[PDB]
């Protein structure tokens, strides 16, 4: 597919005298330009390039480029119509997900997330070209029971939990309040055995072990109930 949201770039620190035409000139090197949005007063905008390949190149070549006083901030736009799908079947493909969710409208891209051993995590990603399509899908899959394969256990569609592991939380953006300063007095140190803090922070290191042993009981609880429910259903299908 071409002119997907995945070739859509946010551009920041633009000068106030920016025109729809100069932003097209700036990106002239990267072929055909689709939709352009600009707010001159705020000095940010959106440019949608032909392919992800050209947006990946444009991003790197133009991020931190100087322009009339400031250095440009070029990023990939956050997807506006991305869903997380949970409770995926045991046997599932990128292609099945795209086909399944194309019922609600244009799907730009669908992915079954896999571990390094190549097995699915149980999560997947569905990215629609438009927000309405994502809205229908999200709503209809909440009220309805959406089934990709024969096995009659339905998919769970959530809005995408969009996280950042690129920029993170830099010191400059951390808020400088009273609690900040109080927290930021004692430096990073290995707590020495026998001190106030050591047997305090030996309770934490147990609270997380039990929380994980609780989260592993929920695992066993729901596995056993899953197993039980499969059997009841096997049998109930034999009632012709």
């Amino acid at each position: 597919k071409t002119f997907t949201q995945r070739s859509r770039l946010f551009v920041g620190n633009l000068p106030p005298d920016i025109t729809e035409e100069e932003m097209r000139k700036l990106f002239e090197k990267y072929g055909k330009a689709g939709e352009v949005f600009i707010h001159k007063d705020k000095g940010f905008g959106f440019i949608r390039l032909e392919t992800r390949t050209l947006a990946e190149i444009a991003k790197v070549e133009l991020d931190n480029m100087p322009l009339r006083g400031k250095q440009l901030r070029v990023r990939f736009a956050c997807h506006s119509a991305s869903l997380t799908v949970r409770n995926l079947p045991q046997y599932v493909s990128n292609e099945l997900l795209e086909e399944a969710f194309s019922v609600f409208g244009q799907v730009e891209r669908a992915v079954v997330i896999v571990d390094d051993r190549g097995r699915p995590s149980g999560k997947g990603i569905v990215e629609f070209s438009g927000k309405p399509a994502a809205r229908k899908a999200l709503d209809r899959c909440s009220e309805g029971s959406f089934l990709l394969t024969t096995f009659p256990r339905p998919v769970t569609v959530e809005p995408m939990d969009q996280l950042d592991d690129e920029e993170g939380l830099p010191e400059k953006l951390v808020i400088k309040n009273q609690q900040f300063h109080k927290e930021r007095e004692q430096p990073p140190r290995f707590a020495q055995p026998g001190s106030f803090e050591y047997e305090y922070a030996m309770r934490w290191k147990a609270l997380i072990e039990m929380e994980k042993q609780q989260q592993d009981q929920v695992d066993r609880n729901i596995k056993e109930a899953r197993e039980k429910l499969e059997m009841e259903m096997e049998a109930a299908r034999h009632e012709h």
């Binding site: 046997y91 599932v92 292609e95 996280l163 004692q186 922070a201 929920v218």
Partner: protein, 299 residues
């Protein structure tokens, strides 16, 4: 920092018939090649470039480009020396997390993962130059109790779970299991009412809800058990700040008693000499009163 594990590209679908210099020509335009490894049998290799950006352009420019009959597969190689770190304060910064984890070896990269509004999630990634530097940081923080703030929240260091959300699980790979094409016999659909599957759809929704109900039950468990540890360790702190005021005040009383007994010693030496003056004054009077008697009865 140049030629890091973040600058390292993977290249798959290489011909078995390649040289290390044929493979190095491929990335000529992107400057001096660093670390290079090839595995001719499995038709794949690794290259390191100076910067993360050079790698990003190179990946972009060379992925799905022909190499004498084969379409290349260029991805970023999975960081083999990367760590997950959770249970961080919302003030732990990328810079601080780095500073803190610098104590274990050379830090390629340290980020705290932020949500859509830039707030910290209490999870973050630490990438070390060497496997050793990570193993050190893991073994030490798993045994020891590494803190990063005033508040004694320990950091939880696990190995990083690297999930592929790019290539995912394509159909051609899914077809390898015969259970795939079987399950796909029914097409994607909404369970219509009156069908026997509709019933069991809703019984699966019941189990999914029970899972999400029981897992939020664990979140409550944690949240109420830490608020029990906040008051249980803050009252063993006002017992330790009382045992400080108890000892400190008993030292100021013992030293007071001392210096008050010195002020007494001094008073008794003043009283001692002022007595001995008055003892002579009255001694001399007696001698001179009685010596006068002795000169009168001599005449």
């Amino acid at each position: 920092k140049t030629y890091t594990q973040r600058c390292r590209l993977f290249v798959g679908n290489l011909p078995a018939d390649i040289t290390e210099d044929e493979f190095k020509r491929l990335f000529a335009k992107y400057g001096e090649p660093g670390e290079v490894f090839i595995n001719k049998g499995k038709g794949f290799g690794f290259i390191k470039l100076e910067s993360r950006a050079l790698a990003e352009i190179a990946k972009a420019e060379l992925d799905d480009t022909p190499m004498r009959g084969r379409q290349l597969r260029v991805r970023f190689a999975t960081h083999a020396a990367a760590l997950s770190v959770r249970n961080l304060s919302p003030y732990v910064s990328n810079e601080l997390l780095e500073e803190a984890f610098s104590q274990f070896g050379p830090i390629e990269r340290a980020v705290v993962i932020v949500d859509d509004r830039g707030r910290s999630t209490g999870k973050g990634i630490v990438e070390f130059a060497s496997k050793p530097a990570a193993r050190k940081a893991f073994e030490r923080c798993s045994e020891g109790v590494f803190l990063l703030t005033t508040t004694p929240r320990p950091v939880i260091v696990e190995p990083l779970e690297q999930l592929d959300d790019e290539d995912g699980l394509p159909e051609k790979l899914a077809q390898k299991n015969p259970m795939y094409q079987k399950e796909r016999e029914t097409p994607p659909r909404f369970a219509q009412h009156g069908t026997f599957e509709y019933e069991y759809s809703q019984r699966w929704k019941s189990l999914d809800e029970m899972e999400k109900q029981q897992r939020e039950q664990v979140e409550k468990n944690m949240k109420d058990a830490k608020d029990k540890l906040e008051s249980e360790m803050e009252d063993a702190y006002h017992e330790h700040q009382a045992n400080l005021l108890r000892q400190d005040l008993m030292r100021r009383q013992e030293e007071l008693r001392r210096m008050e007994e010195l002020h007494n010693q001094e008073m008794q030496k003043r009283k001692e000499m002022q007595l001995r003056q008055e003892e002579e004054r009255r001694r001399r009077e007696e001698e001179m009163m009685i010596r006068q008697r002795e000169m009168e009865e001599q005449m």
